[PDB]
């Protein structure tokens, strides 16, 4: 197993996950902060005071109550200045005529401010041809959801193996999963795990959390997703502080 | 079978179920215009031209380079004028916890002018239990997507069936599918079929087509969604009333 530098340098690596896995060794964290606020002062200070602890910022522009391409301007000053990627979390699940314009277009123009977004495999490969057609020019990434966090969860068996064979015929575009655990076999694929929390426990809208030891350590993921564990705490710092370790610690134990 | 008219008295029927299939005998017409266009002045100056002649308009409110509240204030007159329902087809597919904020909030607050939105299934219920805690007091409707047009398509075989069983452990919210075909034997449940143009192909992204004969008559569909078939034509009047008129027969044929 390499090391997340080494994975940054693999001949097949996409130069957006070879710029995360140098950032993610660099700083010591492999912390995704899932930013679910609908305020963008709060987005901004918590990217700001939270840019150092975290490799990546998990955006749902869609929820932002005053969202203007100013405030991603502001939010890419903060990734620049503190060194994460901005992911926004779309979850694209069209064909792909449709996504390419959801994509590029509209308000949000999601293309011209996010390093990553993410794709739902079960229309087909034309939702990452689609995407790919704005993506690629535009030197972004893309992750396909091959598992998800939540109870009833479809997403398993042989949908979990097309979304992997998806992302390996397309791996000029895709750069990993959002997954529970490592669902390829091929290391210049990031895995990127939500539904963590340092607690047992769920919400009341089917989510499920594991910790960052099991799905770090345990399941071979590379990146937690930590939305509420940290946004609902009172000291968000120290709290993201906590996950960063947690996750961290697990990574390097894993490598031994 | 029974006619729209009398689907539409149903016990179980859904209050936007009833006023869908109720419009739809007053004006015979199933057809449901997918208004897949950039420009507020081209969507509302199609609503209102083409209102006469479908049951519903679907919009991607995320393609729109100039939404904003009131594009879908004057959308929702023209709706009323010319009895139409509103669908913005945004695919939810994400944790409820999630789905509620996308579907209430941000920019577009999908719930305040939308009769019905679409849901993917593979997340689980927790997607349908999360809009419903928006969607049921504001008195609106969801369809859960069992099948899809796209090349590829993973709702197949189990996948279908599980969507089948989510929108009838649902029926107070979910009124419907997107479908191919006829996937539930309840007749409360409306089938909305997307990928229709009168003449045999597909598009270079995976779309594939079918005729309103061949999904209304033969696979047992109530709407078809239609897109570039009118909104790519000169005359999409014209157009409209074409795709109508198949849809309507193929129907009727079908009631015998
Ligand atoms: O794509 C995602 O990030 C996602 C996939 C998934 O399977 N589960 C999941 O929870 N998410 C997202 O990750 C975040 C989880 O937030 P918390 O449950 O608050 O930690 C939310 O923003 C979800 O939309
Ligand atoms: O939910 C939808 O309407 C949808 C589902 C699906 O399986 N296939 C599909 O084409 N659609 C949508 O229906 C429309 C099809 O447009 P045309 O291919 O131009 O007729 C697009 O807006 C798609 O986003």
Chains 1, 2 share one sequence.
Request: proline share 3%.
């Amino acid at each position: 197993e390499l090391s997340f530098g080494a994975r940054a340098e693999l001949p097949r690596i996409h130069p957006v996950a070879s710029k995360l896995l140098r950032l993610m060794q660099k700083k010591e964290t492999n912390l995704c902060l899932s930013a679910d606020v609908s305020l963008a002062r709060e987005l901004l200070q918590l990217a700001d005071a939270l840019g150092p602890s975290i490799c990546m910022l998990k955006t749902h522009v869609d929820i932002l109550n005053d969202f203007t391409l100013d405030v991603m301007k502001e939010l890419i000053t903060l990734a620049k200045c503190h060194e994460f990627l901005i992911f926004e979390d779309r979850k694209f699940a069209d064909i792909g005529n449709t996504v390419k314009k959801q994509y590029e277009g509209g308000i949000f123009k999601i293309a011209s401010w996010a390093d990553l977004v993410n794709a739902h495999v079960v229309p087909g490969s034309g939702v990452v041809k689609g995407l790919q057609e704005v993506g690629l020019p535009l030197h972004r990434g893309c992750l396909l959801i091959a598992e998800m966090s939540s109870t009833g969860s479809l997403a398993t068996g042989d949908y979990t193996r097309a979304a992997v064979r998806m992302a390996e015929e397309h791996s000029e575009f895709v750069v990993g999963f959002i997954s529970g655990s490592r669902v390829s076999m091929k290391p210049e694929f990031l895995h990127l795990t939500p539904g963590v929390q340092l607690e047992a426990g769920g919400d009341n809208l089917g989510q499920q959390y594991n910790s960052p030891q099991e799905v770090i350590g345990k399941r071979g993921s590379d990146i937690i997703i930590v939305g509420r564990g940290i946004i609902s705490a009172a000291d968000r710092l120290e709290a993201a502080e906590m996950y960063r370790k947690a996750a961290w610690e697990a990574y390097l134990s894993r490598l031994g």
